[PDB]
Design a protein around this ligand. Structure first.
Ligand code: ZN
Ligand code: ZN
Ligand code: ZN
Ligand code: ZN
Lengths: 343, 343, 343, 343
């Protein structure tokens, strides 16, 4: 089958196109014929070698994917060939205390597709039936593929970690990244008043159309005051920061006392600094968050089918232009998700 | 193999010994050679026909069980023949929203072993690897088999439903019967002051031995008054009831303002009238609870190995005497679990 | 000053106009010149004698009220004469554990204005500065007076008790009566899909205008079946009931598995028998709720100024017609609040 | 009256002994004749000038205090002369949304005694009746005084922020500090298995006697591994760090994935660094915590009266040796609290 793979751990030039045997489905497993694969930051991390070292090469990247059920292994129930589905990137054992508690993302054997094993940058992929979910009919394959990873991550942050509720002033940093665009929508869904920050008026323009109530350009090293102004001088109650590596000094200045700040986990190895004194004294909470319970995908897709949440496909390129896709992310030039059309 | 089948629905006499073929473990399944099967009131409802209608016959009852791993399916890890284990009676599909969230006991396809599928009243039983936990080595097989079902039910009521915490006055109804044995111990484990009620002086004496700080006899028409007197006149904060529909009026009377009452399988007789406006005006909360999440069996067994929680085996009977065992249980005379010894 | 005193306990005719001396504000107290006093079912229980026995006479009823600051005690800040305000009907000692925890409505000395102390059925009333909130400027005095009592009760039931969240199917009983008006709006505010039930077509039509997504008529012996049909057959997840003791059997039937039912002042007639084992087997939860924490009045009024929540004034009557007002309320005919105009 | 005051903002030499007019009680206020005053870190901070700048000098330090009610102002209820009491250092307005919600420590007007106004380093002090609590009879004045501030702070951290429960492995850093000794006890009370760290075997010896299950000396730059070893290799689930400025790099290495770490707020202005990448990726939560709801003191004292919690008075000196007391803290030479006998 056709697939993009990485011969080495370098820049986007390491991603090449080759042929690999079509994987076969095992018991309780399912083979999917991919129609679309979404790019994720996790991809670039592994591609550089900052994540998942000593990984078997060549490697097939890709955590987000959508398509049609090609074949089911022995003992499979709930899926058949021809069925449209989207992948749920969370691979867990399903036996440990964490999994049985609905916390598979905390499983000691937790693995994201394309991180440890071959992902969605191919025409085919096999995975446990439990990791497959029906694709909504009102969406295109590309749109479907862009949902899972970022929506899951933004859901844990906004709902479970920040406990967002109506009345809350939510600050979403760097509107434009996959996590951001979903966090803005989910936060609105929970009655929040969203304030989104970005580095260009163009991204702010898009954040506004996405549902943001107020927007702030952090190009000006005084944006925290603006955020304070927009929130009656008290600052944001809850903050969604998909990185923490962007003017975090300001973020905390924009955050209300007792405020909560959620930071989307990443294997970027980024070493920075976190203000102790004037952070814990103001009783601020800084919560690391990564992916989310696989159970979150069902209600997320439902809201997407109802139209309350929408995927944000900024660009689509052919699977073979995977390299070009990575440069689009590394150069941060697209508002929303980057999707690869497969087949 | 030897097994106690259910020829037809009716009195305990319908339970007879028969020879059934040995079940074979599927892909992710394992066959356990049973040593002890604990008796639950659920087995009685199935026997009488009150539960699980349209149930094929013959049927093997039994939700609780302990034993040794006999054989394991092809693709199965974490279990080998010889391993001592106890059964996690909760069966679900592990693919729906409820299951992925850990709330398997709320799965639309949720099933308790022995309720619809052959249970533990045999020398062998086959279940998914997800429903098997290591048997604590400090316990006898009859003690181990007695844990699961009641400890899980008592745990959801005390920990999740009632949110028992140190300083709480917890009231447990009818000691020695149902989930009281486990509820008194879990309650204390969470820092509460337990007040237990029973009918005989023996059971109350038995209650204190389990950790009950105070005892009350509900054979008197004014026992609710003693509970009030025993808690500074305010009444109990949290209440664990598995009988109800008889003393419920007394419980409601014994419950302090804003108190919480957790009800297990209170399928008693008449429902009188239930003095409402008493539960509303005083902001009381009545919570129904059946079983618990499979994940809860891990902390339980851990506390059991430490000796902070322990099962109470009231009587042991040979497997071929399941009938006599159902009699003992139906008359609620024995203090503790009735356990069948298989092999 | 003019006031409607309660000469004796009995029918609404016991309410008569009398001249009482003007109360004087203590140290941290303030005297409010009332403009409107909203009528609550509580005023009726006090009038009949069913509530607050040993109550000195004459007594001035009235828990809800709005007006202008008249005079303030010596040591008081944050209030000046001329300021428009609404009353927070919750009176507590503010020194006990319950009060310091915010749960003032659970204070052992908790008292609702007008229940034991002179209320709002007069031209002036004196209460602690802690029980006064700024009146939203976008509302008329009768609209303002209608908010507090019902919005606080509906909020604790929806937000704290039921934990309503987006995607939830909330069922509100008897629209236009009690806390339904507020519950339908708060429910929607928290992202639920509201199904409202009423007796007349007018009230149901009125319900949808308030945000009710679906409507059902409980005049039919099978209305519970419509709620089930209206929620994918599963039933309502959360239920707000302020009547009970009459349709409660229907509610329980309309409640989905593991559902929660919040009950306000369901002090209806007979209690029939209440089909238990249905609330236990299906793990249902019945929660009693009276009033709410004073702190909750702040977010409520904020949403009211934004227009996300709005009071519904059913009828206005001059203060001297409190008697006629109690009739209108006792017959549960008027849709919305019955508000007395003082000055 | 005799009292210790600070003429300037320098070392412990600025604390002098002088005479100041005896403060008079106002409405709803109470004058206390101090018998003992406990030293707190907050004291040294303000004494140096790192906290509460532009504060009126001379200033009377002291947040913790116990003694006898000297006189009550007009309109006081609940207290009379001769009554033994301990101070609740949290001064809040009692009107803002935070206060009425039981979150007075989050009030915008929150002030700790001795931080903004004259504290307990005198023979007399006046404060709102709401800030006074009855001293348990089984305790000496010195012992009583050492409870409030640190126990309150350790309570919010352990119970509210870390949500400690039985089964949890709690890591308490720097056993010896006021917060630590209380955190160890409260954590045990909630069923935790406590691991305490310190720099000398002597403090570890005392932490063991206090209730710590396991102890680790962080003098050895490899202690995190030891903590991991003691917790089956998974690390601590919850961590109490009353500073964060002590081997925080190790703390996070000793913390289990998904773990929670509570840091006691301080106006030390300590600027350090917080590991981003490998912290949020492991889904760690870092929670700033300061003081606690005044409501927490009641249940805390109760547990002290029951004997479940005990104050830890490491040393007592005469009020006039306040300077010496501060050097004992600045030189960190005492396990537990330092108390000043007054009068
Ligand atoms: Zn797992
Ligand atoms: Zn399921
Ligand atoms: Zn109170
Ligand atoms: Zn305040």
């Amino acid at each position: 089958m056709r697939a993009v793979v990485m011969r080495a751990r370098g820049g986007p030039e390491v991603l090449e196109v080759a042929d690999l045997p079509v994987p076969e489905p095992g018991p309780k497993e399912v083979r999917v014929r991919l129609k679309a694969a979404a790019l994720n930051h996790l991809d670039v991390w592994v591609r550089k070698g900052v994540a998942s070292p000593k990984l078997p090469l060549p490697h097939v990247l890709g955590a987000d994917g959508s398509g049609v059920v090609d074949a089911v292994g022995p003992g499979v129930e709930g899926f058949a060939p021809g069925d449209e589905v989207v992948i749920n990137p969370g691979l867990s054992c399903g036996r440990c205390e964490r999994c049985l508690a609905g916390e598979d993302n905390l499983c000691p054997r937790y693995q994201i597709l394309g991180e440890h094993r071959h992902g969605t940058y191919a025409e085919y992929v096999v995975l446990p039936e439990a990791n497959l979910a029906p694709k909504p009919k009102n969406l295109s394959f590309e749109e479907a593929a862009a949902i899972p990873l970022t929506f899951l991550t933004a859901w844990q942050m906004v709902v479970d970690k920040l406990g967002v509720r109506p009345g809350d002033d939510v600050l979403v940093m760097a509107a434009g990244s996959g996590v951001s665009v979903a966090a803005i929508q989910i936060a609105k869904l929970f009655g929040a008043r969203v304030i989104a920050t970005a580095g260009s008026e163009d991204k702010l323009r898009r954040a506004k159309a996405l549902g943001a109530d107020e927007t702030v350009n952090y190009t000006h090293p005084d944006w925290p005051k603006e955020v304070r102004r927009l929130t009656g001088g008290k600052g944001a109650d809850k903050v969604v920061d998909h990185t923490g590596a962007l003017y975090f000094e300001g973020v905390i200045k924009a955050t209300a006392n007792g405020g909560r700040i959620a930071i989307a986990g990443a294997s970027s190895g980024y070493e920075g600094t976190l203000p102790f004194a004037h952070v814990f004294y103001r009783q601020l909470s800084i919560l690391g968050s990564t992916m989310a319970s696989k159970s979150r995908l069902f209600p997320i897709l439902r809201f997407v089918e109802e139209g309350k949440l929408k995927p944000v496909v900024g660009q689509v390129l052919p699977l073979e232009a995977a390299a070009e896709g990575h440069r689009l992310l590394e150069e941060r030039r697209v508002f929303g998700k980057v999707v690869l059309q497969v087949g």
